[PDB]
Structure 1
Amino acid sequence: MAYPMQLGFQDATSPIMEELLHFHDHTLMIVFLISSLVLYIISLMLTTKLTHTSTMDAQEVETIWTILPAIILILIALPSLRILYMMDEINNPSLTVKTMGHQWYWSYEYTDYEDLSFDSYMIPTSELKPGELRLLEVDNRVVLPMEMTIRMLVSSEDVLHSWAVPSLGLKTDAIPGRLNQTTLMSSRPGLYYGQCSEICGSNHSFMPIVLELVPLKYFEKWSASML
């Protein structure tokens, strides 16, 4: 989750999200370089009484400023693409959960063995118990086993919705009639919050996501007591 007065990304709960933080730092370092370079050149140009309004030869310097940006783009592209494939990588999940966006709530389905399925709704700010997060708490958290490769399958039963969980570096739209897949893999226990990342009507802002990650043992007992 996000804390007050935050500047950058939420702390990485999973390895690709870590990988992203580092890539962003790399990319951001460059935007700082260029954006400060331009500002320096500008102030430089505007700070002299010396003139040279006659004709100036282009092209010559034109190569420097066309080949340089080209090299820099590779320096970003390479890391970017690697992480890109790393995400769509050949992994073998040990669990498959489904989530279905609905107009103003998500419903989850764990059906590998038994037909377990529940509804996850936001807790009205009015009925929050002290210490509970205003627009983020849901009544039924989606419980999953920490330290395990889970396969999420996102879809919707009405309009478009988007299932996202920033700490894990996930976001997948929920398109009716479609089964989009994503690999979840938290490397640490806890409660991880997310929100609908797609305009879906009146309560678009009020249909959050809360992941609760406990060890396998507790996961399975939870699963059973759930039916």
Structure 2
Amino acid sequence: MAYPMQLGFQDATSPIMEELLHFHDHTLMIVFLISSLVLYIISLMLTTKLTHTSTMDAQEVETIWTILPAIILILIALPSLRILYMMDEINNPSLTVKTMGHQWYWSYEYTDYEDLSFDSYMIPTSELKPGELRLLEVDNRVVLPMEMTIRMLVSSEDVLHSWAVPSLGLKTDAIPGRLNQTTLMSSRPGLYYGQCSEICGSNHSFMPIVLELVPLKYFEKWSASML
């Protein structure tokens, strides 16, 4: 989850989110350098009494400021696309979970073997147990096995929603009539939080996602206790 005064991404919980952090670091360095160079050159143009106001020839210098940005774009696009394609890589999941958005809560279906389903509602601030998080807790968490490749299928039963978990690098829109797929893999146990990410009406702000990542044996015990 985010923490007070945070500046950057939530800590990466999946290998792909780590890839994105390293890619963002690379790209932000370029953003800082270019923005700073422009600021510097502005100050450089503005701080001399020397003048040159006759016609200036532009051809030579425009090679520089077309080829250099073209190279920089390629040095961004190359790692960007590599990550894009590694996200799409065939992975062979061991478990499929569906989630359906609604106004305003999520439901989950685990139907690989048993027909398990349930709803998942935000805890109202007035019902929070002490130390629990305002607008983020849910009554029924998405219990999931850690260190395993999971297929999440996302759809909606009414308007658009979007199913997001920032520390895993996940955001998949929830569109009625459409079954969108993404892959989920947590390197660690714990609780991982997200929020509905497509404006869906009155309580868009108040239909969060909470994953609960536990060892496989514990996941299996949980599934079995749902029978």
In structure 1, distance between residues paired with 2:7 and 2:72 = 26
Cα deviation for residue 224 of structure 1 reads 2.2
User: 1:9 aligns to what?
Assistant: 9
Cα deviation code 1:129-157 (max 9, x no counterpart): 00100000000001000000000000000
Q: Which runs of 5+ in 2 are unaligned?
A: none
Number of corresponding residues: 227
Determine the C-alpha separation between the residues in 2 that align with 1:187 and 1:62: 48
- Which consecutive segments of 4 or more residues in structure 1 shift more than 3 A? none
1:72 is displaced (CA, Å) by 0.3
1:93-143 CA deviation, whole Å, 9 max, x = no partner?
Answer: 000000000110000000000000000000001000001000000000010
1:222 shift after superposition: 1.0
TM-score normalised by structure 2 residue count:
0.99
Residues 28-58 of structure 1: CA deviation (Å, up to 9, x unaligned)? 0000111111111100000001111111111
Give 3-state SS (helix, strand or coil) of 1:10's partner: coil
Q: Distance in 1 between matches of 2:58 and 2:147?
A: 58
1:172-200 CA-to-partner distances (Å, cap 9, x unmatched) read 00000000000000010000000000100
Q: Helix, strand or coil for the counterpart of 1:126?
A: helix
Distance in structure 2 (CA, Å) of the matches to 1:88 and 1:8:
25
% same residue: 100
- Paired residue secondary structure (1:205): helix
- Residue 70 of structure 2 is matched in structure 1 by 70
TM-superposed deviation, 1:3 = 0.3
Q: Secondary structure at the match of 2:113?
A: coil
Residue 47 (structure 1) aligns with: 47
User: What is the rounded CA distance, in whole Å, between the counterparts of 2:48 and 2:7 in structure 1?
Assistant: 38
- Cα shift at 1:217: 1.0
Counterparts of 2:75 and 2:33, CA distance in 1: 14
Question: Could you tell me how far apart the structure 1 residues matched to 2:146 and 2:191 are?
Answer: 11
Deviation at 1:221, TM superposition (A): 1.4
1:82 partner SS: helix
Counterpart in the other structure of 2:80: 80
